[PDB]
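Form 12-C: Joint structure prediction
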Amino acid sequence: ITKDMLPGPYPKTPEERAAAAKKYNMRVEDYEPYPDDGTGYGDYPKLPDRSQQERDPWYDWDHPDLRLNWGEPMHWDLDMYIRNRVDTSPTPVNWNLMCKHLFGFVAFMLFMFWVGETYPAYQPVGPKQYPYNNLYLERGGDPNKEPEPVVHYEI
Amino acid sequence: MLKYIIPTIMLMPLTWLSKNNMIWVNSTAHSLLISFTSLLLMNQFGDNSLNFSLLFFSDSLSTPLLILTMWLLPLMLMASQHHLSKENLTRKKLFITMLISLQLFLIMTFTAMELILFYILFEATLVPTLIIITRWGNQTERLNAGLYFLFYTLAGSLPLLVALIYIQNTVGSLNFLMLQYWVQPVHNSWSNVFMWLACMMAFMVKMPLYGLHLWLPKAHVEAPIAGSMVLAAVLLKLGGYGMLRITLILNPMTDFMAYPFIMLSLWGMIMTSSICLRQTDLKSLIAYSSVSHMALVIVAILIQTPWSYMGATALMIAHGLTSSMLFCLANSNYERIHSRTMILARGLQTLLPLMATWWLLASLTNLALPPTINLIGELFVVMSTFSWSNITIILMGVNMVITALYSLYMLIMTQRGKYTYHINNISPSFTRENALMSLHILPLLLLTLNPKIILGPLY
Amino acid sequence: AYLTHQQKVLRLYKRALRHLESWCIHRDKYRYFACLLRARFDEHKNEKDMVKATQLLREAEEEFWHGQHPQPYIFPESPGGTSYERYECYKVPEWCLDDWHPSEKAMYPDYFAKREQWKKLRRESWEREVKQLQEETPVGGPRTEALPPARKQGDLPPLWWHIVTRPRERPM
Amino acid sequence: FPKYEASRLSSLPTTLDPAEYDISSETRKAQAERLAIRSRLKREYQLQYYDPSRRGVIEDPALVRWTYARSANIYALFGIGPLVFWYYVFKTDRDRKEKLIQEGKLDRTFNISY
Amino acid sequence: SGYTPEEKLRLQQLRELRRRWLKDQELSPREPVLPPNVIYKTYRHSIFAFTHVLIPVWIIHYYLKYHVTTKPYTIVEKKPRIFPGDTILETGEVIPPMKEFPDQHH
Amino acid sequence: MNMFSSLSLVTLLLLTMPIMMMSFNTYKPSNYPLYVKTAISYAFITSMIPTMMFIHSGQELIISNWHWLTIQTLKLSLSFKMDYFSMMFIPVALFVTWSIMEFSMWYMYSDPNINKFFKYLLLFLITMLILVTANNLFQLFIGWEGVGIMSFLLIGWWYGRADANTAALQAILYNRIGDIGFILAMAWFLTNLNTWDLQQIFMLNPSDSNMPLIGLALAATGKSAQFGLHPWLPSAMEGPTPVSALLHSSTMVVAGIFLLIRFYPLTENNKYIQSITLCLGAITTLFTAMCALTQNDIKKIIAFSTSSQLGLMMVTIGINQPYLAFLHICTHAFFKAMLFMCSGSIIHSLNDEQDIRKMGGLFKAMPFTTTALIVGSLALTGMPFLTGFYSKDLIIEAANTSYTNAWALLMTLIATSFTAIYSTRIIFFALLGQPRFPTLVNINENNPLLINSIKRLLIGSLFAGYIISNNIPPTTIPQMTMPYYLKTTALIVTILGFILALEISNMTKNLKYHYPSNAFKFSTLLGYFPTIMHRLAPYMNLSMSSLLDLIWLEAILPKTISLAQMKASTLVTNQKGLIKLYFLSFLITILISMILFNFHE
Ligand SMILES: CCCCCCCCCCCCO[C@@H]1O[C@H](CO)[C@@H](O[C@H]2O[C@H](CO)[C@@H](O)[C@H](O)[C@H]2O)[C@H](O)[C@H]1O
Ligand SMILES: CCCCCCCCCCCCO[C@@H]1O[C@H](CO)[C@@H](O[C@H]2O[C@H](CO)[C@@H](O)[C@H](O)[C@H]2O)[C@H](O)[C@H]1O
Ligand SMILES: CCCCCCCCCCCCO[C@@H]1O[C@H](CO)[C@@H](O[C@H]2O[C@H](CO)[C@@H](O)[C@H](O)[C@H]2O)[C@H](O)[C@H]1O
Ligand SMILES: CCCCCCCCCCCCO[C@@H]1O[C@H](CO)[C@@H](O[C@H]2O[C@H](CO)[C@@H](O)[C@H](O)[C@H]2O)[C@H](O)[C@H]1O
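Section 2 - Result
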């Protein structure tokens, strides 16, 4: 495509805004550049940060999977907003409330797992008894040393 | 090495004196025979390297690179003959001559016993590569890509030349075998710090080290397929091979001079992998993938352990075959849709079912699926780097997660989903294209049956 | 929104009933509440103050958002349903048949004879279709995506090929 | 009813948006103008998509502008910042480990692979 | 609401073409034109057993018997459990029984 | 040993010949699915001969047949461990896989790529057997990642579907995060013990195993979909029902538990790891059973049941009962794979309908599906003397007669009650009541392939628990003395779950209209974990790519370098061409040469 149809520097004047919008197939009212600050966007339009999942599924798009039409300006982060990646569609619950309930559930569970560790359950039973000095030799004890015997009595 | 140098030169008369319609048949047929004879280099011994003469020698590090180099020439002719089909006959022969001269310099680079001989051949590869990119590239930006490639390399090589000539003056020799016995420790001083930087920064640029990597995506995006195959498969490995040889004479100073360059590689590999997730150009994605994979090789070479050199050796071979395959796969699409945009042509598995199997196999090797040599090499570096410092396992582990994400994302974007409605020129895969991918993937998978021959001299 | 007030109310009605049906599950229960909901719409059906009607709608939307099922029923092949796009991997475009090898085309001598007739019909009609659009599109370009019907006999409706020849919904 | 509160990752529903209502002659004239642009572009695409003799790609200038704008700005988490942070973590870790090895206080009884 | 007369007419026209197109997807009788009880089941499972079990097990056994087990520590068995009163086949040794049980019971 | 060793290898070799014939293309695609189904059925029989030998004389052996590679002092071989766990899992896996493939011959009959589907099912089973029989961690890693990739290719079977590609990649993402721990384990074992082979790891018996065991625990979390890395398993319901059946029973999801069972000689001496795994399992079993209470998609309900059951297995690991956890793997394999096949029978008959709200009245319309679904639900809930009783009942008694975290125990009992609640939910809405499906009735379940495949798994769901529990050798002291109220806990809470679930289910028939509680939404929306994390984490990462760096950049930029050379060039070359000015500069050069640099001195 001719050089005049490629992106350029940040627009400065109303005519540099008017020409940029026409280049991007946008209404001049709807055209808004990224704020000038050297980051490198240029005159590329700043389109709403909305996922492609949010677009009408029944409309006959030119690209049905991307839900894009041929010729419309692509969002700067379109590859981040394809239907396989970031989704921004509304949720039945508020975002802040989801975060509070989800974190609260996890924080509460960890608290009670700590209480469980401090006050474990167990049965009213003495320690298990093993013969031959707590199985000294079976557990790899060195035989040359003579271990202090462990003695178990009946009851 | 004359049993390989002379036959390689004979590829030039053969191409120039071949009948007009037979240049691609003859060059490919006889370059494959040279690749067949390259297997005789695998007469390796446990203790001594294979030292042919005063000029050339081969050990377990140069042999796999030599076999990879000579295997690649016939593959680049297959990849090249389509987009050159309308080229003037003489200019076809010159293009093939540039590839032959590149193999000639490369096999001598990897076998040179004298480091200054290595440097001249190491630096001679620039000329054919630069000519290929700027003459047979298809876009305006091929001229800037040529200059960046040229001046990034020379910026590091010229300091290297001074350091090598200094070393021969004070040691008396630059023969690699001699330097193994006459090496002396390098002590702390600002003079030795800059001798260390000169000896290494030329190789770091070719790897490339993160920070000095920006010439690589430029060159790849603008180079022809054959230029991308050699550049990714072999030319990046020149830096790794140079670092594996030069670090012999930089101890023990490498203990603390490595730190900044390990940090760049450990962090750089995470960032380059993440960048691959947002690349819009297919060739540029594969280029940034190499930077991520070659950062492992830099870390492995710098920590200097037996396991890290075996891992680095395997990585270089494995990445060479994988990256070359990925570029050829993206070229097969480009020859159809004539664009490098990854999102342009989607759902190709429907239209090109067998080419979708090659895409799957290439992606799996890129993410290093066990027991591929891509994993074996990557695993050995992780094992040794964990010993170097346990905390690195976090960065190593994260990189494997991100590497999986963009490898399969590139597979899903181009091969799955719905096909692009208006693109109606996706002709069935040619026998030439299918054979080209099988010649990458079959040898790569066969080496799993016998990986010792790609594990280098410390095996 | 492009939709008129009348269109907005109807879409809410259909949406409200469907989410009500998800809550009730049982058909007898759903029938009872569906009639109560229809009563609420019928109550203000004749409101003539478009500021009150607009208010009634906006409040209704807020109530729906509070009462919507978090997991409403979706028809399996509707967007979001469990079979949505399940068959897209079996839909092959018809232009792929041009690349078939002669030996492949020889197994269907009669299908590929009919196919040529359609291709001929497409070739012969195209020029007229382009002309019809040019002499019906107002200066400056179209204002809507609606396309015209054919007027003369022996004319096909403009831009018909990719609609008529599209893949079947169960292509394999 | 508790009002909807919109986040970056959870946008506001259209049905809950005051703008969508209160139709104004200017907003409709803006909506009618956008539809004209979309229909103009759709006709441009359709006259090539439906052309019997077109075999190839319908180059989209919108996609060319997108890739071109994305690939241009070649050159925190991108400077010395991350590097210095990680330098001290590994230097600190390897300094402690080296001291323990020298003091024989690090167990490497069976460590012979490195 | 409904279709406008032009909207209705266009759908009618595309409808005729679409249904004729779908009718043309049917295959003629000759198409495709290809180029040039227990006894049966028992045979079918006899061949599968022979090719997929007997031949593989012949190859495995030859491999394990004459190539794997001839190398040290290639196949390692957990040694057999010996119980009181057992007899060793190799050495003919008898293992003593256990001592008399205290003989609690219930 | 000759018959034992030889036959345990032909089992594995037999599964690969169908793969070799497809790849070598000397086969016959006339009936490839039947060929693959036949191969499993024979491999199951050949695997029973080694198993009987183990049952009889406790025979176990290791086969290290091929020396692959030596790395200085680390020698790697193709090494197969045919022990208690391998000899009991292989026949159970092959028996269930035999049923799934027979069911697949009916369910996927109209799929044009049926041959590829059965090729992928077989490769999916082959990697699971590599994983199960691996004697060293490298060969185990081959199987670990093998099942991961085969899950990816089968979850995303319908690759035109965008949600199937999202779900397939999400399985890779979570499982690959788990592999960070797996690589951590291999690194620690190589560094500290000099081995990846299990025999040497157990012989050296490291005392300081906190690091390697956390690595294996993190690996098990992703593979077994424990809390934190859990969402992918419900999302894996994108794949065809046969994939869900095989994925959730005798392949991928139990590899995480199976990995921790392999390393019980280490974990049994590490109380820190036991507490971590107990609490991880306890939260997983509660959280995913709570989610199942309000799911309306039949596959998702069964999927969340599997996560709940996998948590219970992880709890069993935590209370130091490795063999109970293994027995639950084997028993769960029968009835879970049957429930997924019973659900597939319903989905197929109701024209791809999966939502339970549009089912009902199937109790008599689908008699055989109904019988298997009740047996399956009773087996799952721990009905006395069905397959699931012989593991779940033992596990609960062990847990509540153990020195354990009290919160972990309570959450495991409540989750057990929830198991009855969501089992009633499937039975009540799918089978009881009046039909709620569309009018054109196509209910048909008379295919012999469907009947036989479910019939065999039905028989396993009844007696398999009894058969296995009576043949395995004892390896622990089973605690059989406890108060009546600890012995009968599992039965009681399960019964209360049935009663409580029945009342709520009947409560939906009333003409009442209710607003969702925050609790109802929280369960329905899976705790908001997928809603938050799957938007926030991808967004932070995908959008992830000071004055000091300004100097390090602006100074070293190629633009900076190239643009200073342009200034210097212009200064050098922008001259007036005047003899007067050039010779005036010759004068200055000479003066400063002498006065300033003393070049004449
Ligand atoms: C055996 C049971 C096992 C599972 C037990 C799980 C217990 C988990 C309890 C977590 C509680 C966290 O959730 C808590 O709920 C209330 C109810 O809205 C929230 O309250 C929130 O909602 C409304 C407004 O929206 C207001 O009440 C309040 O201003 C607001 O904060 C709290 O902000 C939140 O902290
Ligand atoms: C970091 C280690 C090695 C660094 C080596 C750096 C030395 C310089 C190497 C590149 C030299 C290229 O020299 C020249 O540079 C500029 C930009 O850089 C290019 O010019 C390009 O960029 C400039 C500004 O960025 C634009 O005004 C111009 O329109 C564009 O074509 C020239 O086409 C190229 O001829
Ligand atoms: C990519 C960038 C990489 C950056 C790497 C930075 C590494 C920094 C290395 C610092 C070590 C330099 O070398 C260090 O300095 C001087 C050499 O002049 C030596 O010391 C010598 O000079 C100093 C002068 O201050 C005297 O005090 C001292 O009497 C003398 O022996 C030190 O004993 C040596 O250890
Ligand atoms: C580390 C050492 C590396 C050594 C590398 C070798 C140095 C070679 C220096 C070549 C510099 C001359 O190259 C010249 O650079 C300027 C940079 O402004 C470019 O200038 C370009 O951008 C500038 C503004 O940025 C424009 O005014 C100009 O129109 C445009 O051409 C020229 O197009 C290029 O011709």
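Section 3 - Comments
Residues 33 and 44 of chain A are 6 Å apart (CA to CA). The longest helix of chain A spans residues 95-118.
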